[model samples]
Target chain A: AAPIDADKKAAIKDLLDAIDAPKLVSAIANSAEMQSKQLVPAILSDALSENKTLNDKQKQAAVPTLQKNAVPKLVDGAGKVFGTQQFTNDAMQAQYDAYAKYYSTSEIKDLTTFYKSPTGRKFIQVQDQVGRDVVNGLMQKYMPQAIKATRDQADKEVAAVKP
Target chain B: PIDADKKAAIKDLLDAIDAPKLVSAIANSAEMQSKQLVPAILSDALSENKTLNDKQKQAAVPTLQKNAVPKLVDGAGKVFGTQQFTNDAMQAQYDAYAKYYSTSEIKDLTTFYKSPTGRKFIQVQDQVGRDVVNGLMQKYMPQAIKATRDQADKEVAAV
Candidate 1:
């Protein structure tokens, strides 16, 4: 990677500060983690319930332990260890490197201007809502057909051979 | 504060675009069925101790078929309808649209959506969503995960 000159370096710093880059990164992490609350539990529950290795009684016992002890510790550890200054800094540097490569100083300046605007604040506030709405819309449209197809396919898979 | 007149206009806009029908259509979509419902059903059916023989699986087919669709539909409806989705959508749109544009601008949008061009857009909206997801899954997500992994590795090495 090419070295950033002082002028460009200052501009990047200003841009990052203007956007509260650390707060933004932290917000993304927090939002992702929160969203994963639904996903991780579902995934874990599915895997637990489907485990060929465990019987019904054992699977029942395992899930609570998995949720209460196993998942929380791991999630907390990641939050503490990787969710630190050095990590955010390294991540920010990587992003800065990309910005330097792709974005002109004037473009960065323009982004800073937008970030300071009312619309920009609203953009930040509602981005996740917008994303959910889009996905929910799509899911609403296709879930029924997809479910039927999957069951039919699974049925075929199950029927293709003996146990 | 929004007056009754303004509220009525918003309702009219929502109705003109067939928002309720669109919501129901989305809930019934193949994408939702395949992604959320199938996997859930499979998890339930294939529980750890219940390894059915081939004949058993075959026998189970009728029961599965009988139950799966309704279960899937009911679950989808409950999640998308009774749960946060409907409320979230209304709030999201109000904030997203109203924040950016005047009520007149929104009416203009409602007019566009009520037009043929708008109907066409609504028709293909799900396709666009599928394409977006496919693109992300195929390309962007992998790139992002790989980059994050590389960064993690670098951090681990430094430690």
Candidate 2:
């Protein structure tokens, strides 16, 4: 026997279409380009940090696209996992990036000035660990509690929503 | 008649695979990826003083809250939507990678990473992906601002 009458199937199809329209809109709108350029730098940075063979020019070229797309996509992905976490995380990350950039400019300038001496340029050529070490130290000092709270909230949300 | 025939052909083409499962997988993967990136995106977006007016920023709070909710709710289906063969395919890939790494020992098998470079590579992978991308935005902002201002001027000039 047929699972349902033709009329019932038709009615259900209309209902499904109506409900699905917004979701389709959401999926498309979420991936917008403005969102891309505003986010995704950290992933690219991590990749750069991971790959020692990447020349400075290659790293410079690679960063533009990754900056434009990857950061926003990752934040959007996180938001899809847990609702409010996206907002909070995005906010914090943006704030941190702004401040970190400020620090890098001032501090890096000072370091570069010192490194201009023979000892400095030699250090610069082999100074793979400087930024990484600095960031790690800063994160250790500041990130533990903040990171935990962010993760804890997301964990609750993902669990709550999970079927 | 042409449109009707095209629809028929398209339906048949789609029917080669399970359309429902395919759509579900696409939606779920899209949602999962978006959700994973949500915090960073919104943070970066909202942080830009130039992007929104104070009032608009206030208004954006609710929209941002609701925006990714649907995606997360729907993303679970991606796991189940994988065809029966997905598990087999993934298992084969992993098994091969492990085998290659372990047995292909010519005493010097450099897998595109080695020595000081290899060590640095492993260390950087530990950091989050978002931070690096944001750094790039800093470099681009100068040229970007000029371009944007130029575009704004062009629009005004048209008026």
Candidate 3:
């Protein structure tokens, strides 16, 4: 509560630092898909399509505007789960509570020690692969649905525009 | 308030979509992956150690999944938020889909969902999506493999 007890906080931070959990969110925010290429751009495109008549020059300016205003709301969970301050603080608090409830100070220390070792370090890369596989599975499942939704809407919009 | 016709259109789309079932398949696949991969990874890590016993090895299984599954589920929940089927969950999702789609769009999707292409798409979207990702991996995976192996080898040679 209220940022957790200081001892648990220090130990968890030590463990997280050893594993680079904070940097994990930083990587997520800048991951090409999250920013320039896929998720952010794809959704932004859908919203941008709402103004079909906007000229190329006018449309060019919309990206940074969307990146400034909208992308944060979507990826601010990027902040929420692992970064500093605000609702992000609450998200971190939730993770902190979970770690504190299940892991003792000694246990966290032991885990940190493991992470410092060569074998434990390899496990971090392994865990990252598992995460990517799971995430890609979901992405593979959903992007089609989004494309389908967009197609359906486009049909309606097209009909409205034509004779 | 959502109009009756709009509600009907949404319901029809949901009936054809069966999104929750598809997401359930993904969740199950994720759980199975964590199960297979996590234990194997823990063993690989422990293999480098000379002191750990069977009991310690067994203990890592629950610890890994306890952490892993929830993260997977939470991320998937956000991914599939709009596809929820429960009353309150789906009501909000319906509203979300509706905000982007007009009454005509929703009704037309209902019509489209029953059409040959829409019916085929609904039935095969998961496979189609998987195929697309598989194609992407085929095209792009060599660079990823090369970069990772190069970095890994460099790290290995350093120590």
Please, what are the lDDT tens digits per residue for candidate 2 over residues A71-136?
444444432321234433443344334323323333323333433444334433333343334334
Output the lDDT of residue A70, model 2: 48
- Candidate 3 root-mean-square deviation in Å: 28.0
DockQ of candidate 1 against the true complex = 0.08
By DockQ, the candidates rank as 1, 3, 2
TM-score of every prediction relative to native: 0.45, 0.24, 0.33
Off by over 4 Å in 2: A1-163, B1-31, B34-77, B80-89, B92-120, B126-133
The C-alpha RMSD in Å for every predicted model, in order, reads 11.1, 28.9, 28.0
- Docking category of candidate 1: incorrect
Question: Could you give candidate 2's per-residue lDDT for residues B45-146 as a string of tens digits?
Answer: 455545456676666656556743444344322332345334433333233323222222211222212334333333342242244344434433344434
Using lDDT as the yardstick, the better of models 1 and 3 is 1
| Alpha-carbon local distance difference test for all models | 0.52, 0.39, 0.49
Q: Give the TM-score of candidate 2.
A: 0.24
What lDDT, from 0 to 1, does candidate 3 have?
0.49
Which 10-residue span in candidate 2 chain B carries the lowest summed lDDT? B103-112
lDDT, model 1:
0.52
